[PDB]
Write an enzyme that holds these catalytic residues in place. Sequence first.
Site, PDB file in Angstrom:
ATOM      1  N   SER A   1     -10.715  12.075  -3.936  1.00 14.97           N
ATOM      2  CA  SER A   1     -10.242  11.663  -2.621  1.00 14.97           C
ATOM      3  C   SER A   1      -8.749  11.368  -2.676  1.00 14.97           C
ATOM      4  CB  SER A   1     -10.991  10.416  -2.139  1.00 14.97           C
ATOM      5  OG  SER A   1     -10.593   9.263  -2.859  1.00 14.97           O
TER       6      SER A   1
ATOM      7  N   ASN B   1      -6.976  10.183  -6.046  1.00 16.63           N
ATOM      8  CA  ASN B   1      -7.869   9.353  -6.851  1.00 16.63           C
ATOM      9  C   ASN B   1      -8.769  10.185  -7.753  1.00 16.63           C
ATOM     10  OD1 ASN B   1      -7.688   7.894  -3.868  1.00 16.63           O
ATOM     11  ND2 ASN B   1      -7.412   6.469  -5.582  1.00 16.63           N
TER      12      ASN B   1
ATOM     13  N   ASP C   1     -15.668  -2.599   9.994  1.00 18.57           N
ATOM     14  CA  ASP C   1     -16.746  -2.094   9.145  1.00 18.57           C
ATOM     15  C   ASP C   1     -17.695  -3.185   8.665  1.00 18.57           C
ATOM     16  OD1 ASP C   1     -17.640  -1.987   6.182  1.00 18.57           O
ATOM     17  OD2 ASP C   1     -17.516   0.146   6.694  1.00 18.57           O
TER      18      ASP C   1
ATOM     19  N   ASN D   1      -8.402   6.311   3.004  1.00 25.06           N
ATOM     20  CA  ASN D   1      -9.116   7.218   2.102  1.00 25.06           C
ATOM     21  C   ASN D   1      -9.869   8.385   2.743  1.00 25.06           C
ATOM     22  OD1 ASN D   1     -11.786   7.718   0.268  1.00 25.06           O
ATOM     23  ND2 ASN D   1     -10.004   7.276  -1.017  1.00 25.06           N
TER      24      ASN D   1
ATOM     25  N   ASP E   1     -12.034  10.297  -7.892  1.00 24.91           N
ATOM     26  CA  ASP E   1     -13.202  10.875  -7.233  1.00 24.91           C
ATOM     27  C   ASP E   1     -12.850  12.088  -6.376  1.00 24.91           C
ATOM     28  OD1 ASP E   1     -11.911   9.781  -5.066  1.00 24.91           O
ATOM     29  OD2 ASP E   1     -13.559   8.463  -4.460  1.00 24.91           O
TER      30      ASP E   1
ATOM     31  N   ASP F   1      -5.535   9.022  -0.613  1.00 24.61           N
ATOM     32  CA  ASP F   1      -5.218   7.961   0.337  1.00 24.61           C
ATOM     33  C   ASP F   1      -4.003   8.455   1.109  1.00 24.61           C
ATOM     34  OD1 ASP F   1      -7.215   6.180  -0.744  1.00 24.61           O
ATOM     35  OD2 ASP F   1      -5.841   5.781  -2.401  1.00 24.61           O
TER      36      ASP F   1
ATOM     37  N   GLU G   1       0.824  -1.204   0.000  1.00 26.13           N
ATOM     38  CA  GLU G   1       0.000   0.000   0.000  1.00 26.13           C
ATOM     39  C   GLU G   1       0.860   1.256   0.000  1.00 26.13           C
ATOM     40  OE1 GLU G   1      -3.061   0.750  -0.304  1.00 26.13           O
ATOM     41  OE2 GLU G   1      -4.129  -1.146  -0.060  1.00 26.13           O
TER      42      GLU G   1
END
Length: 129
Positions: free
Chosen positions: A50, A46, A101, A59, A48, A52, A35
């Site tokens: 956003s 990204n 989650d 995110n 959209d 990371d 990662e």
Amino acid sequence: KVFGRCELAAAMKRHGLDNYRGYSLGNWVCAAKFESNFNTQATNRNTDGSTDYGILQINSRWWCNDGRTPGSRNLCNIPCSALLSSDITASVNCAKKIVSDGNGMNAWVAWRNRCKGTDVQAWIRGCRL
């Protein structure tokens, strides 16, 4: 900061990630490797809008607030800048909320693609834990 493989394994174990929600320590070290390549300051933008952040690439659309992401929910209730610290506490605490989650570690693309189903023990062998 750039962690060494074993140094990070020890740090994560200290923060209670070993076997957390059913995921052995090797899974977490493997995820950080693909990662962020163990770099606490890694960032990736990204499509959209956003970004990371950190060693676990958390995110900004769902977990932390960076003030420039549309539709952000800040479910970890923390500024994304806190995830770029040399101390991984903030990142670990948020990761624990993410994995709880309901989708395990699939929240991490690199983990799904390169760790899941492999011999993750390899990531901690040779280490003094």
